[PDB]
Design a protein around this nucleic acid. Sequence first.
RNA 1: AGCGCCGUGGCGCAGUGGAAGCGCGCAGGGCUCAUAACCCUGAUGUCCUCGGAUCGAAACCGAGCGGCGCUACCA
Lengths: 470, 23
Amino acid sequence: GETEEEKRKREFEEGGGLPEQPLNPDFSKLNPLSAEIINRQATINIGTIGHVAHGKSTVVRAISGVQTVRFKDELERNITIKLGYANAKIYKCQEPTCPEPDCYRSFKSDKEISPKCQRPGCPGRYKLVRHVSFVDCPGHDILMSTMLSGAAVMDAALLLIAGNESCPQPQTSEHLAAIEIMKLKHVIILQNKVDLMREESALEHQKSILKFIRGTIADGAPIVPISAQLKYNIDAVNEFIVKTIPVPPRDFMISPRLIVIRSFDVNKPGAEIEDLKGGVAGGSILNGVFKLGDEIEIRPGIVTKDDKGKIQCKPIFSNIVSLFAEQNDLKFAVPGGLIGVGTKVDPTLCRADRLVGQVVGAKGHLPNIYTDIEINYFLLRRLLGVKTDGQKQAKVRKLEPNEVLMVNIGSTATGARVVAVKADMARLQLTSPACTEINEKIALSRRIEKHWRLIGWATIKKGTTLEPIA
Amino acid sequence: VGLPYSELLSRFFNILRTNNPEL
RNA sequence: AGCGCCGUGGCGCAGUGGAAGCGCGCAGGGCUCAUAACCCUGAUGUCCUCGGAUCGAAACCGAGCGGCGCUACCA
Ligand SMILES: Nc1nc2c(ncn2[C@@H]2O[C@H](COP(=O)(O)OP(=O)(O)CP(=O)(O)O)[C@@H](O)[C@H]2O)c(=O)[nH]1
Ligand SMILES: [Mg+2]
């Protein structure tokens, strides 16, 4: 006669709960899968790529259980501009007797260390191998900077293909090539529709998907039949994530940095402002451990235009108040994931798509803002995303001086003008400020068929610096 | 190697046949 | 989540501080040899819940039901 909530409570108590992180742990010995780290933070960022109207948030929800908002009335149904997120934990059964394929089970972040095994007949307990964060990416042809920024964030890929539709989906190929651009090679192919399609169509679609990916950079990509609503073949997904995808080399030997993609103003309506919260910027830490209590500044920050037309860049110093990750406020931040940094940054600064694609650095470093950048660029032979009805997919043209091109340096979305075009090198003038940290793998897109279309890749080799104003 | 892909497909079809014999 | 807006007689509007409203609908009747036009009378209301002051409240206000416009997804 025990209520379900008290049952979940005794499960949480028996599972060990969620222990608080130590205030100052020895950071030399902390590996990304330590109990102090992995029980309360995701360490690998997995992103879903696919064509529109195929279902990516639903798949992650079936994996994890955390919903991806889907806000803004009009965007409740069609497409979402900003990235959708969900927390997932990979729990593996410790009992060897139960079959390996169903040992894996993906749970919400609200779960404990050692939850009971839900298979009928198994008293054993699960072990949390790793927490994984899910950076969902828009899969539409208009929103192109967002998916490139998400790819700059994410570390593992899940490609989504429909079964009953046409095999050579161009949006998926564009996404796959975009991931190929930035030194990311772990992609898992996931067939969304398996219930509504036949047995021989299954082999036909398998063969088509195999034939598509033969000459691209990724060669050994696994394929898995999944279903977003039937809630099946989820354990094998976690198995593939565990086995195929390792942790890229990332430690604390590197200087701290941040890359903010989403802005969040914490201003609860109706309640008195005497009890208010700060401004939260959603940023990935690709390098450097962060802790409660720091001085940090965004480099481009305030972008003002004077009476003479010159652009003045005021970096925005801010004292971080908290580092929200997973479910609980943490004391140390584990790099290699999106954490919500809540700081004293003015709430209006975090309201709209203002902190979208912007680099941030802790005090003790000086990232450099650039206004004219020298890039080295390489192109593909054909455009990706165009549906020519049976004729020679649009061939890529060579660049022209004084044209606007969307030059996505990591997460930044910049419309640059071209100054000089060489065979491999070019110079870009940016009215929207951009910053340089080390190399910053860049993506390039242009405009022919209205909406932006990817063309190739670029890497910064030089630039013209603008000193931040104190 | 897509050999470990047809197996999950077989499992999915078998689950469908057991759960939904009408289809 | 909050800020402004609202509450049919079937419908859109109007007064709402003294008790059931207009016009369009529907029914019936009149005019015409006959129809439409025109002219009369109707039969339809818990004018969204709980309450208040008041000889009075759909109406004036408040502890809420429902739906819009707006800020807008507010970790
Ligand atoms: N029959 C079937 N329908 C599915 C499946 N997966 C998703 N859908 C349907 O796709 C529709 C779109 O869902 P949604 O996840 O919001 O699309 P989206 O991926 O966010 C749009 P974009 O790809 O551009 O980001 C849903 O109605 C869902 O029922 C599936 O496996 N089978
Ligand atoms: Mg989305």
